[PDB]
């Protein structure tokens, strides 16, 4: 996609960036590797649209990141033994009141979601500060902007699996696997730890730019892709294990197919 | 940008509340055995009186 | 007014530098007698979990 | 006061307050008790001249004072046992990076200057926040605005004692008392610890509004007032002891005469 790229460059050259235009471009086509972190940052409001203010704001963010890192070290909550994702978890927890009594106190179910997304972000975003900031904002969007939609997604999944392949849904129901499907993996962690980040990022392009329905179509798509192997599985036990641990090499295809599906069922607008 | 810096100050106060608790915690732990040695660190400093003097 | 608030923030970072030094000092003091009993106390906070896992 | 107070009220009702008008008034006249703390605050720039912003600005200052106070308590430097002036010394030292190892480490020569000014402020200004703030600012003036003049003051003292009573200055010289005079009492502590606060404050009205020469004239005036008793002293020793501990109930006079002397030699204007 060059000309996908040129068309994006022409938007990025505006003194004030069109947030709404950057959104619909992301919904329509995938972001080129070299501009992904930048667009996500603008869309998650980590850089203001006003192009000049970038360095001024990036400073504040870097300085805050360092201050917070240091404070965590002063207390015993992080050390250099600490992995980057746990570091972001504590930074988030600090900046939000919610920091546990000690670093050993066990991890509450939502913390593990943060960890999951953060580990994935690490592979998508090189800079350590951008990475923190995007993870913090990404997760914050699930807890606010999508707070009401996310619990509706398991239903949507059944609605759309059905139109695409009824028999498979029936088979899921017959094995009483439908209530045992790994929904949190799909709609809490948005597929972090499930799809290789090189493809997951194209899904997140959409999540970042305002759509969480796309998540449903990745789920439907994972099922269509492994229709044959799943219809062969008798226990609900066997089904859940498989969907927790899916073969990796089809993912490029799953994600593109998923995006198509979602357009087919929902559509999206035009871009120069 | 207003929000970006205001954000940090908030983090700054956040930082100090954490540090506060640690401090109150560490005092507690040292309290298990009399902080008296703290009362020695004190006199001795006042003893650092003549020293200076 | 900008100066009045900036003033506070600077005092705020002052405060923390003072806190920082205290913390580093109290660690040192508690270090004279092993704080590993502290870590021990921890090892327990993963035992009440297991029970806390009920 | 009236026709002196009325004149001041007229300047207080300016929507933006005139620093320079308020200064020359303070140099001319003594401030009425009810407006002293307010004028000192504006002149020391604790409240901006813009009359609306007072409430907003006082709010920041209150919160600074509380934040710092708490920290000192957390760290065991102050308790409720601690006298107000020692509390302000620590608050000062904190906000200036100059906080000792511990509160028991004995007090450096400059800290006792602070304590002295602080104890005096405690009698001039009821409000605990106003008082710290004014003390802080007052002191900061000695270290900044007046740092070049303050060590030239003992010479001005010789200059002006001489003009007022040459014989006395000779006598001081004959006992070689001139090097041993309590200069830091007069010119570092500005008479804190020496003159009762009800009179000292009229001296300080002048120091606050920008002149430190007044301090010279308070010293000259102390000497003329005790001309006869001093002329009677043989040791330089005996002269220093006396000036360290001068009788109190002449002060109102000493200060008024001192203010006159200073006007005579140095001048100041009238008003609307």
């Amino acid at each position: 996609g060059v000309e996908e790229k040129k068309s994006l460059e022409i938007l990025l050259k505006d003194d004030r960036l069109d947030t709404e235009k950057l959104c619909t471009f992301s919904q329509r086509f995938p972001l080129p590797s070299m501009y992904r972190a930048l667009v996500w940052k603008v869309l998650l409001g980590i850089l203001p649209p006003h192009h000049e203010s970038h360095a001024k704001v990036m400073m504040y963010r870097k300085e805050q990141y360092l201050d917070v890192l240091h404070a965590l070290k002063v207390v015993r909550f992080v050390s250099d033994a600490t992995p980057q994702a746990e570091v972001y978890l504590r930074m988030y927890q600090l900046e939000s009141g919610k920091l546990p009594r000690s670093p050993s106190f066990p991890l509450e179910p939502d913390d593990e979601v943060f960890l999951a997304i953060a580990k994935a972000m690490e592979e998508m975003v090189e800079d350590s500060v951008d990475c923190y900031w995007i993870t913090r904002r990404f997760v914050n969007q699930l807890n606010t902007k999508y707070r009401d939609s996310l619990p509706q997604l398991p239903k949507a999944f059944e609605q759309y699996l059905n139109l695409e392949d009824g028999r498979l849904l029936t088979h899921l129901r017959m094995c009483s696997a439908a209530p045992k499907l790994p929904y949190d993996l799909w709609f809490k962690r948005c597929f972090a730890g499930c799809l290789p980040e090189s493809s997951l990022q194209r899904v997140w392009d959409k999540v970042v730019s305002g759509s969480c329905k796309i998540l449903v179509f990745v789920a439907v798509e994972i099922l269509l892709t492994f229709k044959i192997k799943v219809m062969a599985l008798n226990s609900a036990e066997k089904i859940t294990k498989f969907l927790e641990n899916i073969p990796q090499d089809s993912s490029d295809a799953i994600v593109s197919k998923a995006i198509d599906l979602w357009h087919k069922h929902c559509g999206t607008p035009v871009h120069s | 940008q207003l929000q970006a810096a205001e954000s940090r100050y908030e983090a700054q106060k956040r930082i100090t509340q954490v540090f506060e608790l640690e401090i109150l915690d560490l005092y507690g732990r040292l309290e298990k055995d009399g902080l008296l040695k703290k009362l020695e660190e004190e006199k001795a400093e006042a003893a650092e009186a003549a020293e200076e003097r």
Side-chain angles (χ1 to χ4, degrees), chain A residues 156-221:
Chain A
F157 164 77
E158 284 178 332
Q159 170 189 348
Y160 291 99
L161 179 52
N162 181 77
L163 316 181
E164 298 286 329
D165 183 352
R167 269 169 270 263
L168 188 43
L169 182 54
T170 312
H171 171 78
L172 288 183
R173 266 134 174 206
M174 293 276 21
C175 315
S176 27
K180 298 282 136 225
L181 287 186
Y183 289 116
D184 326 63
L185 174 64
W186 304 336
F187 314 128
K188 273 166 193 196
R189 301 169 177 220
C190 315
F191 299 97
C194 162
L195 293 177
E197 292 66 40
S198 59
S199 335
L200 191 52
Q201 61 185 351
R202 294 194 264 130
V203 185
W204 283 7
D205 281 349
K206 273 77 197 168
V207 189
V208 163
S209 58
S211 150
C212 67
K213 266 168 108 199
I214 176 68
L215 293 172
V216 178
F217 304 93
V218 169
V220 168
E221 192 44 55

